[PDB]
Write a protein that binds this ligand. Structure first.
Ligand SMILES: *[C@@H]1O[C@H](CO)[C@@H](O[C@@H]2O[C@H](CO)[C@@H](O[C@@H]3O[C@H](CO)[C@@H](O)[C@H](O)[C@@H]3O)[C@H](O)[C@H]2NC(C)=O)[C@H](O)[C@H]1NC(C)=O
Ligand SMILES: *[C@@H]1O[C@H](CO)[C@@H](O[C@@H]2O[C@H](CO)[C@@H](O)[C@H](O)[C@H]2NC(C)=O)[C@H](O)[C@H]1NC(C)=O
Ligand SMILES: *[C@@H]1O[C@H](CO)[C@@H](O[C@@H]2O[C@H](CO)[C@@H](O)[C@H](O)[C@H]2NC(C)=O)[C@H](O)[C@H]1NC(C)=O
Ligand SMILES: *[C@@H]1O[C@H](CO)[C@@H](O[C@@H]2O[C@H](CO)[C@@H](O)[C@H](O)[C@H]2NC(C)=O)[C@H](O)[C@H]1NC(C)=O
Ligand SMILES: *[C@@H]1O[C@H](CO)[C@@H](O)[C@H](O)[C@H]1NC(C)=O
Ligand SMILES: *[C@@H]1O[C@H](CO)[C@@H](O)[C@H](O)[C@H]1NC(C)=O
Lengths: 170, 313, 311, 156, 313, 159
């Protein structure tokens, strides 16, 4: 649970994708959305809407009142199943929306924390867990340095000594 | 230097509901409940519907002088209350089964089988054509000629390749006096023959209420004459005989539709007495009485999923 | 420390992946309770027939005692007072369904016994006051003066509502019994209406005695529109109507079979084992319900887990 | 998971803190009650659509239609039973997993507040008084205040 | 120390509401698709099978139809049986009679009134040839006149058996009025069948008809269930097709009439299909809609596989 | 973070140690097998099956009633087909997410066991002080004692 949690607000200035990073550098400050996680989720939610619509089977029915006044018992029998199927479909659809609406919003909570742990596991003691979903580097890190946090190609032992020394300064 | 992780957010107002949380604002949402219709009748798979503007199926099937050609239709539409049913009052035996069989027809063609010249002929003011009284066009009213009513024996044989639908009727006069005036013999019989059908109809002389100024009655019947089968008539003198038949080919079934709307050159997969539906969606809420491949009817107003994440603007 | 609640809870729920689980608090969504007595449906008392069929109460069976509105009808599994004189009713079930819910029902005299003067008819099969009698609401026309003539009478609905007419024909046992009752050998009943056009003929056939009677009497019915007129004409096998019933039909229900008896209450859902007062979505009380009810389910416990698991 | 058995002695709410000092979190508990109460109501109220019902009215020579009425009645009893029984089984697990997430997320709501100012011990975490543990419940806890006090007793 | 999950050389794939085509460790299909292609019993009860006969042809003593099965669960007749009524005609409430006989706990044919007591003379037609030499229905008797008149036949059978008893009888509709006098001297004829429940009187219907099996005349059949202590009374003037045999019946359950071309195999099932029985504990199948017995729910799908193991890469 | 899974692990579904001297966890796997066994069983056993007969018993003059029996056979097919299809897709996601859960719950079962006595590498693996085969049965058991190896970790961490 990260959306309603430590990352309280959603970055209203991010349009590239759904989940992304924000870097504060002396050289610049900007947003860069993680396309790998967003495209997996954009395809993921569309897979759910399509399966709800495509798995439905329709086989042509002609629904009309064809019984006369001396056949009202059969007329009520057709009413029972017409009204019975409206009750089955209305209830199943309404709850299907509610159940899958939750599983969508929680699918976004999990994808955020998994990406938060993707950075947290990547750089371990080379930064400090601030608590906003943000990490402050113990060392210096420029614009090309932050491909690696996004890509996943971040070398911890390169800047480790800079983190081990700038930490004992107390 | 710092790195922050976050999620999308936009100026969105669309709301969805969660089984645990109500009124949740959302980035992007999609609706799956069809609420749209175009308000005009259309075809089904490109096949037109047989539409009767002011006539019932019986009034159009018989030759009602007030009723006004189509070789094929997918379904039938008739108004809530047609004003041109049977001009001369009466009944139609197995009328609902006959309508359901004619709901969807592959081929339909009127055929003359036994003409008027071979059959004298009777008329009533309950069926006006042009000020002057007329009668049903597709059938003949047999009244006595030269004051003596003899026996009629006429057999038509279906020689066409399809099944054909024969219609005929019997007349129930008001009292015993009107019968002798029209049909000389006091006791009357009508026998119809077929490899399937065996019946013998006797008129019912009974005092009744005036309907369109007519206390008499006329009750109609029908069968389907198999391709090489023949139908045989033998009447004492209460006969309302067929002059025209209908070659039919039966390949599909639909229902009879009730709506006041009319035709527009459109096409659709699902039909509704309020207007057609063009939907890939799984549900709708337009009308219960539908014809065609349709979404499931649902008693609701909103079925909105959450395609995007929850938003706080 | 960070922890969660726990109490002395005994209610157990089930999980799609766990067979047997204990839980803090549990809520049931399956209604299993009824009150064991009939009530009103949306504030309308039902029409209850103690030992009477719909045909026995509609006709004038003396065993049944002589209400303008009811939501549904209750009759026992097998009422002991159907037709005191044996016979059959034509379209009896469609008539019952038509009368299952009536907004206005009122018995009216249309053609009194005084107007039928051929004579009346009586049988020992229908005892009323220890003496042989017949149906209260219909009359059996038997020949008078040893000569049966033609009876021609018509009634014209003059009311602002529809009215229901009942009549019938008598099927004698043999050809000799008819001549004694009805001098004409061949006989007809012709009923005329803007809608109805029928002609009844008796069928003489040897039959077994039911309630000490070998003959039969077969009944028919129609609805007379507010300005239409019904016309009877009989050579003399006529069971003629004396009473009719003004009908205002605004909704439909069913006939209910239950041995229960009335309690002064009200309900939205009715059951032959007692009405239900529930807003829950499911029940396992009975399949044969009348009114807005939860859905019938074959289960004993449908309990959700409102609280967290507790051990 | 880690916090085993729960507390029998907690009656404030469902999720709560325990303090052992020299001298419940209603926010997480209130959001949970609102969520589950909404689940029960929606399972009851979204099916609120209901109309009239009837019984059986077919004679002995109409038993084919009576069997057709039996087919649809037994068919709907099969549908509603299977849906309801599975709906209860499915939503009960999602309810139990919903409590698992709330407890661990409440564990991180405190874990993110104090980083090196304490040691992760059973879901239990310098000196801290009764007014100090208001900061743990509210989400308004200060890290740099007791930073050096922990930095020095950590290396002892 | 490393922590990991299982993986095996599995190509089995399942689908997910958000992912499609997941290679998975273990998979289980819950959709039944296999059937044994042969007719089996039902919970230990054999079925009544008619190779080339319909129920009407098997019930009446049709000379071509063959078999005293005292108990059966359901009835099998092929698509278009070739042995219905050897003499053409109709069967009244035929479909309701078939639905009643679909499941019978006890069945036994009983002679109620023999051919000797009806000595009118017996009637035979070429439409029902037993062995080239013409015969009639073996269970009913065609009562044709003797010498100069048709004296009224009065015969009654008071049921004294312990079970309900099914009676069949019929009426012959001649081709023309001349044929009736030849067979039954009286021109106006009747058949009166009386029961505490039944009150019936039949009149033949003279009508010119087409030849079916070389016969233009028809024969309509009727039936009732005579309660244990009840009596049935026959009084006819001619045109009478009289009952010679009846059936004791015990009714304890209902079933349907099945259309299939297969034949019996010594097997037992809880669910039967016109393409072959099913032994499935699965909740779903896709074999055939027309099923008998406790069965899984019919579904239109080819694969319904759950995922039992974790995903594999 | 645990990519590809262990193909050399056949003891069960769910530790791998590279010590100087694969053993699956017996509890976490059997409890997982019990659940998935219960899900498939509850999906099947909750179905209610009754004796029903389908036969197309209506003649040619009863086709309206025949069309009514059609609409309900067609209605129930569309219901069961849509429900059975979506139930599989929903429960298959739950099953695979349930397996992602059991893998992570075991990762934290070992992580909280040895805290500052090891380093989270990032592949679901840790690097310890020294630990033997009888020391890693203590990690599997849940009977891993922190105060025994605390000083050795605090000393080799300042290197
Ligand atoms: C159908 O056949 C049965 C069998 O005979 C007939 O039932 C019987 O009817 C007779 C006379 O109606 C009954 O006679 C009597 O027994 C009572 C004592 O139980 C006695 O008080 C009388 O004096 C007389 O002896 C006989 O009991 C009765 N049998 C049964 C089993 O009820 C029946 O009448 C026949 N049906 C018709 C309508 O012909
Ligand atoms: C039933 O009674 C009504 C009442 O008299 C009759 O209606 C009248 O019909 C005549 C001629 O059709 C009209 O001139 C009157 O105005 C009608 N009266 C009303 C109040 O509408 C009716 O004819 C009777 N029905 C029959 C068939 O006898
Ligand atoms: C209807 O007309 C057809 C065509 O004449 C008749 O069918 C033929 O009957 C004759 C004599 O029975 C045969 O020689 C022909 O071979 C038949 N033709 C076919 C295609 O079978 C038929 O008999 C007439 N039907 C009736 C009832 O009279
Ligand atoms: C899932 O993937 C499979 C293959 O990856 C797709 O199916 C193949 O479909 C073709 C065409 O029918 C068959 O010839 C192959 O036998 C199938 N292979 C397998 C293993 O299924 C399938 O279409 C994919 N599903 C979706 C929805 O994309
Ligand atoms: C949800 O919002 C709609 C309009 O926004 C409103 O009608 C409704 O009352 C709201 N529900 C609640 C519980 O606030
Ligand atoms: C669940 O446990 C109770 C007692 O422990 C027992 O009555 C019941 O049979 C159990 N259910 C199953 C399915 O084992």
């Amino acid at each position: 649970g990260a959306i309603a949690g430590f990352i309280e607000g959603g970055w209203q200035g991010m349009v590239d994708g759904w989940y992304g990073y924000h870097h504060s550098n002396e050289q610049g400050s900007g947003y860069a959305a993680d396309k790998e996680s967003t495209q997996k989720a954009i395809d993921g939610v569309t897979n759910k809407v399509n399966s709800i619509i495509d798995k439905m089977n329709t086989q042509f029915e002609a629904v009309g009142r064809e019984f006369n006044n001396l056949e009202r018992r059969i007329e009520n029998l057709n009413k029972k199943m017409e009204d019975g199927f409206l009750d089955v479909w209305t209830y199943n659809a309404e709850l299907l929306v509610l159940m899958e609406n939750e599983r969508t919003l929680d699918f976004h909570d999990s994808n955020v924390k998994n990406l938060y742990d993707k950075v947290r596991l990547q750089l371990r003691d080379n930064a400090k867990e601030l608590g906003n979903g943000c990490f402050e580097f113990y060392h210096k890190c420029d614009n090309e340095c932050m491909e690696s946090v996004r890509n996943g190609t971040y070398d911890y032992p390169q800047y480790s000594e800079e983190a081990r020394l700038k930490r004992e300064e107390i | 230097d710092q790195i922050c992780i976050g999620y999308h957010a936009n100026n969105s107002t669309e709301q969805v509901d969660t089984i645990m949380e109500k009124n949740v604002t959302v980035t992007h949402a999609q609706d799956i409940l069809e609420k749209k219709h175009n308000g005009k009748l259309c075809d089904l798979d490109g096949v037109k519907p047989l539409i009767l503007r002011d006539c019932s199926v019986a009034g159009w099937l018989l030759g009602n002088p007030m009723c006004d050609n189509v070789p094929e239709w997918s379904y039938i539409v008739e108004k809530a209350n047609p004003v041109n049913d049977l001009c001369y009052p009466g009944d139609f035996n197995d009328y609902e089964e006959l309508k359901h069989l004619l709901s969807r027809i592959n081929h339909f063609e009127k055929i003359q089988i036994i003409p008027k010249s071979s059959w004298s002929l009777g008329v009533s003011s309950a069926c006006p054509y042009q000020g002057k009284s007329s009668f049903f066009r597709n059938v003949v009213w047999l009244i006595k000629k030269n004051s003596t009513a003899p026996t009629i024996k006429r057999s038509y044989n279906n020689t066409n390749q399809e099944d054909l639908l024969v219609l005929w009727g019997i007349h129930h006069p008001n009292d015993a006096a009107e019968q002798t005036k029209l049909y000389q013999n006091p006791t009357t019989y009508i026998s119809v023959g077929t490899s399937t059908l065996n019946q013998r109809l006797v008129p019912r002389i009974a005092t009744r209420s005036k309907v369109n100024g007519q206390s008499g009655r006329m009750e109609f019947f029908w069968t389907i004459l198999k391709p090489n089968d023949a139908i045989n008539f033998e009447s004492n003198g209460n006969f309302i005989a067929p002059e025209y038949a209908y070659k039919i080919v039966k390949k599909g079934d639909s229902t009879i539709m009730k709506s006041e709307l009319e035709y527009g050159n459109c096409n659709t997969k699902c039909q509704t007495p309020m207007g057609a539906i063009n939907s890939s969606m799984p549900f709708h809420n337009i009308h219960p009485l539908t014809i065609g491949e349709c979404p499931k009817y649902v008693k609701s107003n909103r079925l909105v999923l959450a395609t995007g994440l929850r938003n706080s603007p």
